[PDB]
mmCIF file with all atom_site columns, C-alpha atoms in Angstrom:
data_model
loop_
_atom_site.group_PDB
_atom_site.id
_atom_site.type_symbol
_atom_site.label_atom_id
_atom_site.label_alt_id
_atom_site.label_comp_id
_atom_site.label_asym_id
_atom_site.label_entity_id
_atom_site.label_seq_id
_atom_site.pdbx_PDB_ins_code
_atom_site.Cartn_x
_atom_site.Cartn_y
_atom_site.Cartn_z
_atom_site.occupancy
_atom_site.B_iso_or_equiv
_atom_site.pdbx_formal_charge
_atom_site.auth_seq_id
_atom_site.auth_comp_id
_atom_site.auth_asym_id
_atom_site.auth_atom_id
_atom_site.pdbx_PDB_model_num
ATOM 1   C CA . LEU Y 1 1  ? 55.093  124.088 16.369 1.00 57.91 ? 1  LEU Y CA 1
ATOM 2   C CA . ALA Y 1 2  ? 58.657  124.098 14.974 1.00 56.08 ? 2  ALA Y CA 1
ATOM 3   C CA . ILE Y 1 3  ? 59.982  124.788 18.467 1.00 56.57 ? 3  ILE Y CA 1
ATOM 4   C CA . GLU Y 1 4  ? 57.668  122.346 20.275 1.00 54.95 ? 4  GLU Y CA 1
ATOM 5   C CA . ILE Y 1 5  ? 59.041  119.620 17.983 1.00 54.44 ? 5  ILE Y CA 1
ATOM 6   C CA . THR Y 1 6  ? 62.524  120.389 19.336 1.00 56.09 ? 6  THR Y CA 1
ATOM 7   C CA . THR Y 1 7  ? 61.302  120.246 22.930 1.00 56.40 ? 7  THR Y CA 1
ATOM 8   C CA . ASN Y 1 8  ? 59.549  116.928 22.288 1.00 53.41 ? 8  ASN Y CA 1
ATOM 9   C CA . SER Y 1 9  ? 62.622  115.472 20.573 1.00 56.67 ? 9  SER Y CA 1
ATOM 10  C CA . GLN Y 1 10 ? 65.025  116.393 23.385 1.00 57.37 ? 10 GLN Y CA 1
ATOM 11  C CA . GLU Y 1 11 ? 62.626  115.281 26.134 1.00 56.65 ? 11 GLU Y CA 1
ATOM 12  C CA . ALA Y 1 12 ? 62.029  111.975 24.333 1.00 55.83 ? 12 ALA Y CA 1
ATOM 13  C CA . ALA Y 1 13 ? 65.780  111.372 24.068 1.00 56.54 ? 13 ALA Y CA 1
ATOM 14  C CA . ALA Y 1 14 ? 66.198  112.175 27.768 1.00 56.01 ? 14 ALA Y CA 1
ATOM 15  C CA . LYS Y 1 15 ? 63.303  109.844 28.619 1.00 57.62 ? 15 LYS Y CA 1
ATOM 16  C CA . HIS Y 1 16 ? 65.096  107.122 26.656 1.00 51.94 ? 16 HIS Y CA 1
ATOM 17  C CA . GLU Y 1 17 ? 68.321  107.795 28.568 1.00 55.08 ? 17 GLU Y CA 1
ATOM 18  C CA . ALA Y 1 18 ? 66.352  107.702 31.829 1.00 57.03 ? 18 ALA Y CA 1
ATOM 19  C CA . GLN Y 1 19 ? 64.992  104.335 30.700 1.00 56.98 ? 19 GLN Y CA 1
ATOM 20  C CA . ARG Y 1 20 ? 68.607  103.395 29.947 1.00 59.45 ? 20 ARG Y CA 1
ATOM 21  C CA . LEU Y 1 21 ? 69.618  104.062 33.534 1.00 56.56 ? 21 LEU Y CA 1
ATOM 22  C CA . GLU Y 1 22 ? 66.475  102.316 34.819 1.00 59.39 ? 22 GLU Y CA 1
ATOM 23  C CA . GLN Y 1 23 ? 66.897  99.240  32.628 1.00 59.47 ? 23 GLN Y CA 1
ATOM 24  C CA . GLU Y 1 24 ? 70.632  98.830  33.231 1.00 55.86 ? 24 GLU Y CA 1
ATOM 25  C CA . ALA Y 1 25 ? 69.822  99.218  36.929 1.00 54.75 ? 25 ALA Y CA 1
ATOM 26  C CA . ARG Y 1 26 ? 67.148  96.509  36.816 1.00 53.15 ? 26 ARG Y CA 1
ATOM 27  C CA . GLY Y 1 27 ? 69.572  94.392  34.799 1.00 54.23 ? 27 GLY Y CA 1
ATOM 28  C CA . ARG Y 1 28 ? 72.293  94.100  37.401 1.00 56.20 ? 28 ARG Y CA 1
ATOM 29  C CA . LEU Y 1 29 ? 69.577  94.229  40.056 1.00 53.51 ? 29 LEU Y CA 1
ATOM 30  C CA . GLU Y 1 30 ? 68.595  90.826  38.686 1.00 52.78 ? 30 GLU Y CA 1
ATOM 31  C CA . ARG Y 1 31 ? 72.191  89.551  38.589 1.00 52.43 ? 31 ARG Y CA 1
ATOM 32  C CA . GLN Y 1 32 ? 72.909  90.637  42.155 1.00 47.21 ? 32 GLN Y CA 1
ATOM 33  C CA . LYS Y 1 33 ? 69.683  89.159  43.489 1.00 48.64 ? 33 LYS Y CA 1
ATOM 34  C CA . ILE Y 1 34 ? 71.065  86.128  41.656 1.00 47.18 ? 34 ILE Y CA 1
ATOM 35  C CA . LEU Y 1 35 ? 74.585  86.159  43.113 1.00 48.15 ? 35 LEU Y CA 1
ATOM 36  C CA . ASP Y 1 36 ? 73.397  86.672  46.679 1.00 47.58 ? 36 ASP Y CA 1
ATOM 37  C CA . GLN Y 1 37 ? 70.982  83.769  46.270 1.00 50.39 ? 37 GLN Y CA 1
ATOM 38  C CA . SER Y 1 38 ? 74.060  81.878  45.034 1.00 51.81 ? 38 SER Y CA 1
ATOM 39  C CA . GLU Y 1 39 ? 75.845  82.383  48.354 1.00 51.28 ? 39 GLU Y CA 1
ATOM 40  C CA . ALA Y 1 40 ? 72.656  81.679  50.311 1.00 51.46 ? 40 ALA Y CA 1
ATOM 41  C CA . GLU Y 1 41 ? 72.220  78.316  48.573 1.00 50.67 ? 41 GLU Y CA 1
ATOM 42  C CA . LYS Y 1 42 ? 75.943  77.563  48.913 1.00 49.95 ? 42 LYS Y CA 1
ATOM 43  C CA . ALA Y 1 43 ? 75.465  77.528  52.676 1.00 50.33 ? 43 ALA Y CA 1
ATOM 44  C CA . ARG Y 1 44 ? 71.932  76.144  52.582 1.00 51.77 ? 44 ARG Y CA 1
ATOM 45  C CA . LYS Y 1 45 ? 74.017  73.134  51.582 1.00 53.75 ? 45 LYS Y CA 1
ATOM 46  C CA . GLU Y 1 46 ? 75.384  73.053  55.142 1.00 56.09 ? 46 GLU Y CA 1
ATOM 47  C CA . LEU Y 1 47 ? 71.894  73.836  56.449 1.00 56.71 ? 47 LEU Y CA 1
ATOM 48  C CA . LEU Y 1 48 ? 70.340  70.756  54.984 1.00 54.26 ? 48 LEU Y CA 1
ATOM 49  C CA . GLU Y 1 49 ? 73.366  68.499  55.480 1.00 54.66 ? 49 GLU Y CA 1
ATOM 50  C CA . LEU Y 1 50 ? 73.271  69.105  59.215 1.00 57.28 ? 50 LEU Y CA 1
ATOM 51  C CA . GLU Y 1 51 ? 69.480  69.454  59.472 1.00 54.10 ? 51 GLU Y CA 1
ATOM 52  C CA . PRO D 2 1  ? 76.690  150.972 25.461 1.00 52.11 ? 1  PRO D CA 1
ATOM 53  C CA . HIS D 2 2  ? 78.338  154.181 26.744 1.00 53.98 ? 2  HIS D CA 1
ATOM 54  C CA . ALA D 2 3  ? 78.200  154.751 30.511 1.00 55.53 ? 3  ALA D CA 1
ATOM 55  C CA . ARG D 2 4  ? 81.747  155.185 31.843 1.00 53.46 ? 4  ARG D CA 1
ATOM 56  C CA . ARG D 2 5  ? 84.454  157.452 30.464 1.00 53.22 ? 5  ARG D CA 1
ATOM 57  C CA . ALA D 2 6  ? 88.007  157.850 31.735 1.00 50.91 ? 6  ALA D CA 1
ATOM 58  C CA . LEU D 2 7  ? 91.280  159.284 30.472 1.00 49.75 ? 7  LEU D CA 1
ATOM 59  C CA . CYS D 2 8  ? 93.248  156.101 31.235 1.00 52.66 ? 8  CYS D CA 1
ATOM 60  C CA . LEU D 2 9  ? 93.122  152.640 29.660 1.00 49.86 ? 9  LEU D CA 1
ATOM 61  C CA . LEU D 2 10 ? 93.395  150.198 32.574 1.00 46.40 ? 10 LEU D CA 1
ATOM 62  C CA . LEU D 2 11 ? 95.909  147.527 31.541 1.00 47.05 ? 11 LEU D CA 1
ATOM 63  C CA . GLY D 2 12 ? 96.171  145.750 34.897 1.00 46.34 ? 12 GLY D CA 1
ATOM 64  C CA . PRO D 2 13 ? 94.232  142.565 35.652 1.00 43.26 ? 13 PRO D CA 1
ATOM 65  C CA . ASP D 2 14 ? 90.591  143.300 36.470 1.00 48.30 ? 14 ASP D CA 1
ATOM 66  C CA . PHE D 2 15 ? 87.079  141.910 35.992 1.00 49.10 ? 15 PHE D CA 1
ATOM 67  C CA . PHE D 2 16 ? 83.655  142.801 34.605 1.00 46.94 ? 16 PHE D CA 1
ATOM 68  C CA . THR D 2 17 ? 80.655  142.160 36.876 1.00 48.30 ? 17 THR D CA 1
ATOM 69  C CA . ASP D 2 18 ? 78.512  141.451 33.821 1.00 46.78 ? 18 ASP D CA 1
ATOM 70  C CA . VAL D 2 19 ? 75.272  139.458 33.804 1.00 46.80 ? 19 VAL D CA 1
ATOM 71  C CA . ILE D 2 20 ? 74.093  137.707 30.637 1.00 47.77 ? 20 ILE D CA 1
ATOM 72  C CA . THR D 2 21 ? 70.648  136.386 29.628 1.00 45.08 ? 21 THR D CA 1
ATOM 73  C CA . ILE D 2 22 ? 71.358  132.983 28.077 1.00 44.50 ? 22 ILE D CA 1
ATOM 74  C CA . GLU D 2 23 ? 69.058  130.169 26.964 1.00 43.86 ? 23 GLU D CA 1
ATOM 75  C CA . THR D 2 24 ? 69.991  126.482 26.995 1.00 43.30 ? 24 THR D CA 1
ATOM 76  C CA . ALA D 2 25 ? 68.752  123.706 24.708 1.00 44.77 ? 25 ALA D CA 1
ATOM 77  C CA . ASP D 2 26 ? 65.879  123.133 27.157 1.00 43.29 ? 26 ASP D CA 1
ATOM 78  C CA . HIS D 2 27 ? 64.964  126.793 26.477 1.00 38.30 ? 27 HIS D CA 1
ATOM 79  C CA . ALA D 2 28 ? 65.659  127.538 30.158 1.00 35.95 ? 28 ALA D CA 1
ATOM 80  C CA . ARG D 2 29 ? 65.984  131.317 30.266 1.00 38.38 ? 29 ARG D CA 1
ATOM 81  C CA . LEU D 2 30 ? 68.450  132.094 33.043 1.00 36.84 ? 30 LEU D CA 1
ATOM 82  C CA . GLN D 2 31 ? 70.539  135.165 33.769 1.00 37.39 ? 31 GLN D CA 1
ATOM 83  C CA . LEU D 2 32 ? 74.016  134.620 35.141 1.00 38.32 ? 32 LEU D CA 1
ATOM 84  C CA . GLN D 2 33 ? 76.608  136.981 36.599 1.00 41.19 ? 33 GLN D CA 1
ATOM 85  C CA . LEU D 2 34 ? 80.042  136.824 34.971 1.00 34.72 ? 34 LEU D CA 1
ATOM 86  C CA . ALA D 2 35 ? 83.494  138.110 35.894 1.00 32.70 ? 35 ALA D CA 1
ATOM 87  C CA . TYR D 2 36 ? 85.783  137.948 32.819 1.00 32.02 ? 36 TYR D CA 1
ATOM 88  C CA . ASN D 2 37 ? 89.133  137.818 34.582 1.00 31.22 ? 37 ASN D CA 1
ATOM 89  C CA . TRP D 2 38 ? 91.104  139.839 32.030 1.00 28.27 ? 38 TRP D CA 1
ATOM 90  C CA . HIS D 2 39 ? 94.437  141.607 31.618 1.00 27.48 ? 39 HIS D CA 1
ATOM 91  C CA . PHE D 2 40 ? 96.159  143.421 28.779 1.00 29.02 ? 40 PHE D CA 1
ATOM 92  C CA . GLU D 2 41 ? 99.242  141.803 27.245 1.00 27.89 ? 41 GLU D CA 1
ATOM 93  C CA . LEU D 2 42 ? 102.190 143.661 25.702 1.00 31.44 ? 42 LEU D CA 1
ATOM 94  C CA . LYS D 2 43 ? 105.361 141.802 24.745 1.00 29.57 ? 43 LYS D CA 1
ATOM 95  C CA . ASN D 2 44 ? 107.243 145.001 23.798 1.00 29.43 ? 44 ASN D CA 1
ATOM 96  C CA . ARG D 2 45 ? 106.099 147.911 25.955 1.00 29.66 ? 45 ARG D CA 1
ATOM 97  C CA . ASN D 2 46 ? 107.831 150.598 23.886 1.00 30.38 ? 46 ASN D CA 1
ATOM 98  C CA . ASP D 2 47 ? 106.791 149.952 20.271 1.00 29.92 ? 47 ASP D CA 1
ATOM 99  C CA . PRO D 2 48 ? 104.397 152.692 19.069 1.00 32.07 ? 48 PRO D CA 1
ATOM 100 C CA . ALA D 2 49 ? 102.381 150.369 16.813 1.00 34.53 ? 49 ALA D CA 1
ATOM 101 C CA . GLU D 2 50 ? 101.666 147.697 19.427 1.00 34.81 ? 50 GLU D CA 1
ATOM 102 C CA . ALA D 2 51 ? 101.188 150.286 22.180 1.00 33.76 ? 51 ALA D CA 1
#
């Protein structure tokens, strides 16, 4: 038991760091979805002007 | 503990093809072959005490 507690603690911390990578990834995933939609709408301006 | 025996103390650079049995924080028992690039050092190669 006193060694399984150590295994659980280290694996939990690594799971949290894996969630860190995942959540930071999803975070700028959102922002870059956002910025590319920015450029798309910037020229959808010309789309709908000329359409 | 006591396998080799020779009359001469090799001072020149050499190595030890040693393998250890280590365990990391994830308890991962792994053996690993080492070298230990070593060499004896003598600043004054005539002094009886240091020699």
